[PDB]
């Protein structure tokens, strides 16, 4: 269905050159991804560690189909950012069912809604996300070395093209260039790792490698040292692609340079697919008998990356003044928590990993959505600050400095409180959802003997909470340097809206000011639903955590 959607959208996009048609190609992408959700929703009717499909080169698991659904939903939420205009005009006289469905409003919407903004003029933008999504849902379902390599490149190459898609931006072209070049060196490590597996085993199938590893685990001319060495190089490539320290220097630079709409997708989807694939590999490469094979476990690199990611992510973030560099480093310290639960392979840690991943992907989405909405809200605001006139690509990233959010509490209180609720979730403050995620990963590690690592995590959680609080101090502790545009409310500056019934007859004509312009409902409702999920989680936790208890019970079962 994703492949039927790509080819169909591609054929329609190929025969058009109209940039006004981008709005509708993004809307059809949302509808296309909804059919993929309905097909994968029916593919959950069996209890199986896995079924090999298409010649054994693919597999389906309850975890694979659960996370194909999650990827499609996260993509649908991001796709809205290009499916609907950022701002709308609303009047109490056009607010009923009869008005919204049978009547119509006429007014000059071009400068109010930003109809011809850069994001609303890339025809192949909905198409290329679909290509990235395809490589993501293939990685999750790969049962062969070759399929892994081909899927990871399908995802990586499309992420490079997303970063370079704003061609008139000298910041986006640089970021994509940095990403392709450091991403290609990462691909060599993934390709070296799989190549060294096949040359020592004669097999490309993961299950044969799993059985070779299984028989070797017994407490002569062929000692299997290659599996833990090959998987170690194989882990370096994927560590880079999730930006785990020390292979992290690219993300703050690339996430800061590309447009904010783009970094929402780039900074979320790649980590969802890579972390799922690693979990199954960690499980079937485990040692059940402490022998010399267990002394060289590849999973140690993930334990050292987690330790390094916790420290770097929280310590380097202290002196960041650019908001996208800060959120990049905040993601690094969050994958240190994800990497710690992956490295402890226990029933409890695997459940904690599934929750940390889903809840954080959802919460880091709210942080990006709030940022994009705050930038689209300063349309009716003017600033004389000198540090803002010197900024670059102010349309691709309207909010680049944490200084720009000074006094937002005064400009928009609940938008400010939504960002407060999201940020405190990153810290781990109860009753917020982000606390329960870190709780489960501290309890899993403690029960398995990772006490030294748990103490290091709670220390860096205090250090990382410092730069989270600095963003809050800016929004609420100071008055705003942003002031309302004087012209938009001059008492002589009004725009005429006309109300028309079904047969284009003037019901009414209204005089509107900049006060009758608001945020579009697609962005306000999305922010509202996730902020509520972060806040009311302690009343709605049974089926979310029960799903993970069942998924891990099948994986460890027998």
């Amino acid at each position: 269905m994703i492949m039927i959607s790509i080819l169909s959208l591609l054929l329609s996009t190929s025969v058009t050159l109209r940039r006004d048609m981008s709005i509708l190609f993004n809307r059809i992408s949302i509808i296309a991804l909804a059919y993929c959700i309905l097909h994968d929703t029916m593919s959950l009717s069996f209890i199986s560690k896995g079924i090999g499909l298409h010649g054994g080169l693919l597999h389906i698991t309850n975890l694979t189909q659960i996370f194909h659904i999650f990827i499609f939903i996260i993509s649908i939420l991001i796709l809205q950012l290009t499916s609907f205009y950022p701002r709308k005009v609303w009047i109490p006289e056009y607010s009923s069912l009869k008005d919204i469905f049978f009547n119509k409003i006429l007014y000059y919407r071009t400068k109010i809604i930003n109809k011809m903004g850069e994001h609303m003029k890339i025809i192949e933008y909905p198409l290329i996300l679909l290509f990235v999504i395809s490589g993501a849902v293939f990685l999750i379902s790969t049962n062969d070395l070759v399929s892994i390599f081909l899927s990871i490149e399908l995802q990586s190459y499309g992420l490079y093209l997303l970063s370079t898609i704003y061609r008139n931006s000298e910041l986006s072209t640089t970021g994509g260039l940095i990403y392709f070049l450091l991403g290609g060196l990462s691909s060599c490590f993934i390709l070296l790792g799989t190549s060294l597996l096949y040359v020592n085993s004669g097999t490309t199938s993961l299950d044969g490698l799993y059985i070779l590893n299984s028989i070797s685990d017994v407490n002569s001319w062929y000692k299997p040292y290659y599996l833990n060495f090959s998987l170690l190089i194989f882990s370096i490539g994927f560590l880079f692609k999730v930006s785990a320290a020390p292979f992290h220097f690219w993300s703050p630079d690339v996430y800061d340079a590309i447009p904010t709409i783009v970094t929402t997708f780039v900074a979320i989807i790649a980590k969802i697919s890579i972390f799922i694939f690693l979990l199954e590999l960690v499980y079937y490469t485990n040692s059940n008998a402490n022998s010399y094979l267990s002394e060289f476990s590849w999973t140690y690199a993930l334990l050292i990356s987690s330790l390094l990611s916790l420290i770097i992510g929280t310590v380097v973030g202290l002196t960041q003044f650019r908001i996208k560099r800060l959120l990049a480093y905040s993601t690094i310290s969050h994958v240190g928590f994800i990497l710690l639960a992956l490295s402890v392979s226990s029933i409890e840690s695997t459940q904690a990993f599934i929750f940390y991943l889903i809840q954080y992907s959802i919460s880091n989405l709210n942080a990006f959505f709030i940022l994009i909405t705050i930038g689209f809200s300063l349309y009716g605001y003017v600033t004389n600050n000198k540090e803002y006139k010197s900024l670059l690509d102010k349309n691709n990233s309207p909010i680049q400095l944490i200084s720009q959010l000074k006094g937002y509490f005064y400009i928009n209180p609940l938008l400010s409180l939504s960002l407060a609720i999201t940020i405190f979730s990153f810290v781990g403050v109860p009753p917020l959802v982000g606390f329960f995620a870190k709780q489960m990963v501290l309890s899993a590690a403690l029960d398995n003997g990772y006490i030294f690592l748990s103490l290091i995590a709670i220390i860096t959680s205090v250090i990382g909470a410092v730069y989270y609080l600095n963003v809050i101090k800016e929004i609420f502790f100071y008055s705003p340097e942003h002031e309302v545009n004087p012209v938009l409310n001059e008492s002589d500056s009004n725009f005429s809206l006309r109300i028309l019934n079904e047969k284009n007859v003037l019901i009414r004509s209204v005089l509107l000011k900049g006060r009758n312009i608001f945020i579009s409902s697609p962005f306000s409702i999305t922010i509202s639903i996730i902020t509520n999920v972060i806040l009311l989680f302690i009343f709605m936790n049974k089926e979310w955590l029960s799903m993970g208890t069942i998924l891990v019970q099948i994986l460890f079962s027998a």
Binding site: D253, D256, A257
Partner: protein, 37 residues
């Protein structure tokens, strides 16, 4: 590849200057109070 305004250490030194933390010496601050006479 990126501007110095965005990744450079120089503008960190303006947001977080070393002057934010006093380092008065025994001659300047014998009472260890700020040079209060």
């Amino acid at each position: 590849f990126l501007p110095e305004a965005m990744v450079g250490r120089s503008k960190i030194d303006e947001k977080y200057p070393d002057s934010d933390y006093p380092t008065l010496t025994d001659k300047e601050d014998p009472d260890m109070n700020g040079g209060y006479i």
